[PDB]
Amino acid sequence: GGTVHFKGEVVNAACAVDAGSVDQTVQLGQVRTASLAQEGATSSAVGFNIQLNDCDTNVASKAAVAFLGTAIDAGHTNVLALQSSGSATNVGVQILDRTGAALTLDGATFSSETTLNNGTNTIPFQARYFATGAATPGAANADATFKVQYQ
């Protein structure tokens, strides 16, 4: 059972990041080697949310999220590498925003801007496997951190 673990920062800003959202794990399901048999193959995406509380739209009207993690290789900068352990090979984890596109993982590429209401707001995401070749079985755990940008 593969996972991706997210950790954010608790910081004073226009909103307060929810204490559940700031440290969470997403379950990606078993790695099906046959359905990830060639570069570009993807698994079925799994949803997760980053919830923001007590937002004040006089301070910021929009929010976006940037993720940081090890890119699986230079040719796939929007695919997270897996933790070492034997771990699965030729497969990593992607993070998608509401546009459906996978995000670059360098801490400076922000997701689709989301217009805030006062109070609580949810920014929805998805995670999935992305094959860089013929995947091989093994543990599939990834990690990323995130930061919220307000405008």
Residue numbers in the entry: 7 to 91, 94 to 159
Q: Which passages does the manuscript contain on this structure?
A:
The FimA subunits of the pilus rod are single domain proteins of 16 kDa with an incomplete, immunoglobulin (IG)2-like fold that lacks the C-terminal β-strand (G-strand). In the structure of the pilus rod, the FimA subunits interact via inter-molecular donor strand complementation, in which the N-terminal extension of each subunit, termed the donor strand, inserts as a β-strand into the preceding subunit and completes its IG-like fold. In 2010, Sukumaran et al. discovered that the FimA proteins from the enteroinvasive pathogens E. coli, Shigella flexneri, and Salmonella enterica have a second function besides formation of homopolymeric pilus rods; soluble forms of FimA, independent of FimC, act as inhibitors of host cell apoptosis after pathogen internalization by stabilizing the interaction between hexokinase and the voltage-dependent anion channel (VDAC) on the surface of mitochondria. We showed that all three FimA orthologues investigated (FimAECO, FimASHI, and FimASAL) were capable of folding to an alternative, self-complemented, monomeric form of only marginal thermodynamic stability that likely represents the FimA species that acts as an inhibitor of host cell apoptosis after internalization of the respective pathogen.
FimAECO, FimASHI, and FimASAL were produced as reduced, insoluble proteins in the E. coli cytoplasm without their N-terminal signal sequences. All proteins were refolded in the absence of the chaperone FimC under oxidizing conditions to allow the formation of the single, invariant structural disulfide bond. The purified proteins were crystallized, and their X-ray structures were determined at 1.5, 0.89, and 1.69 Å resolution, respectively. All FimA orthologues crystallized as self-complemented monomers, and all structures strongly resembled the previously reported NMR structure of the FimAECO monomer. The Cα RMSD between the most representative model of the self-complemented FimAECO NMR structure (2M5G, model 10, calculated with OLDERADO server) and FimAECO X-ray structure was 0.84 Å. In contrast to the intermolecular donor strand complementation (antiparallel to the FimA F-strand) observed for the assembled E. coli pilus rod, where the FimA side chains of Gly8, Val10, Phe12, Gly14, and Val16 from the donor strand occupy the binding pockets P1–P5 of the FimA-fold, the reversed (parallel) donor strand orientation in X-ray structure of self-complemented FimAECO showed the side chain occupancies P1/Gly14, P2/Phe12, P3/Val10, and P4/Gly8 (amino acid numbering according to E. coli FimA). Due to a lack of electron density, the occupancy of P5 with Val16, previously identified in the NMR structure of FimAECO, could not be confirmed in the X-ray structure, but the two structures otherwise proved to be essentially identical.
